[PDB]
Design a protein around this ligand. Structure first.
Ligand SMILES: CN[C@@H]1CCc2c(ccc(O)c2O)[C@H]1O
Length: 285
């Protein structure tokens, strides 16, 4: 009967990895003073979002699947849903602002210093968190997302069940604000950055060609393919399941949602590979 204990160990490992990586990153930035930089404030915000995710939404969901019941009250179910949506949207929007940060450095190197200072980064981060807060907590708490059909009403009435039902308008607006606009922004900025890098290598080869003396593709692939393959499949079915009711089963929805969660554990591997972080990690442990 491996099922009862087969998934528990995997869920516990995911929780442990998500907590450990982000705690280590936050401590490394806090304790050392060479790693405090304008670029590293966005990484701090993303790490905080991932830490809250892996501490709050995953342990309570794991019990929900394992025990098939919501022992807690009806209030805590709505609170948990709100936290889940908040963390997801905040993480994705922080990824978008990191991409725009990288774009502005290469595109306009002379005016980069005046464009971004310690004061403006704080305002940008606060605005990103406020926008994430309004879209998640505000509509869910006043019950503007509730469905109409009888199954949703029966689910809402019972105090031992916590399942997700939503309207068409809320689902479409949530997907648009959470995923699609950041996806387009990242696509555009990273394409321009790649063009600039290719031009730079061409310029180098035009001059120093006589002596003998890829990476851009590998880096852009690691940055973009992970995000797309982790979060794109979920939002398509999130859009579809409202329009066509019988097509998507609940198990597929939950599986895709949980594949989306694991993206929180892969962020330190992607955004914290510079030698300075490696030295800092070496000193800590
Ligand atoms: C509990 N699962 C939720 C359901 C809907 C949803 C999620 C994440 C981001 C959004 O913008 C959403 O509309 C998922 O995490």
């Amino acid at each position: 009967e491996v099922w009862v204990v087969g998934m528990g160990i995997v869920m516990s490992l995911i929780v442990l990895a998500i907590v450990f990586g982000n705690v280590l990153v936050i401590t490394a930035i806090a304790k050392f003073e060479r790693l405090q930089t304008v670029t590293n404030y966005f990484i701090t915000s993303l790490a905080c979002a991932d830490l809250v995710m892996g501490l709050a939404v995953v342990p309570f969901g794991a019990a929900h699947i394992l025990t098939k019941t919501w022992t807690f009250g009806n209030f805590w179910c709505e609170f948990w849903t709100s936290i889940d949506v908040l963390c997801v949207t905040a993480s994705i929007e922080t990824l978008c602002v990191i991409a725009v940060d990288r774009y502005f450095a290469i595109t306009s190197p002379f005016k980069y210093q005046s464009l971004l200072t310690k004061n403006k980064a704080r305002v940008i981060i606060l605005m990103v968190w406020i926008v994430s807060g309004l879209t998640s907590f505000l509509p869910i708490q006043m019950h503007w997302y509730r469905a109409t059909h009888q199954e949703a009403i029966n689910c809402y009435a019972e105090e031992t069940c916590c399942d997700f039902f939503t309207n068409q308008a809320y689902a479409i607006a949530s997907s648009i604000v959470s995923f699609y606009v950041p996806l387009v922004i990242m696509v555009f900025v990273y394409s321009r950055v790649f063009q600039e890098a290719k031009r730079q290598l061409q310029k180098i080869d035009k001059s120093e060609g006589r002596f003998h003396v890829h990476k851009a593709l590998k880096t852009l692939g690691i940055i973009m393919g992970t995000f797309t393959l982790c979060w794109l499949p979920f939002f398509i079915v999130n859009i579809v399941h409202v329009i066509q009711d019988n097509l998507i089963r609940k198990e597929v929805y939950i599986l895709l949602n949980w594949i989306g969660y694991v993206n929180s554990g892969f962020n330190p591997l992607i955004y914290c590979r510079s030698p300075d972080f490696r030295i800092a990690f070496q000193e800590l442990l």
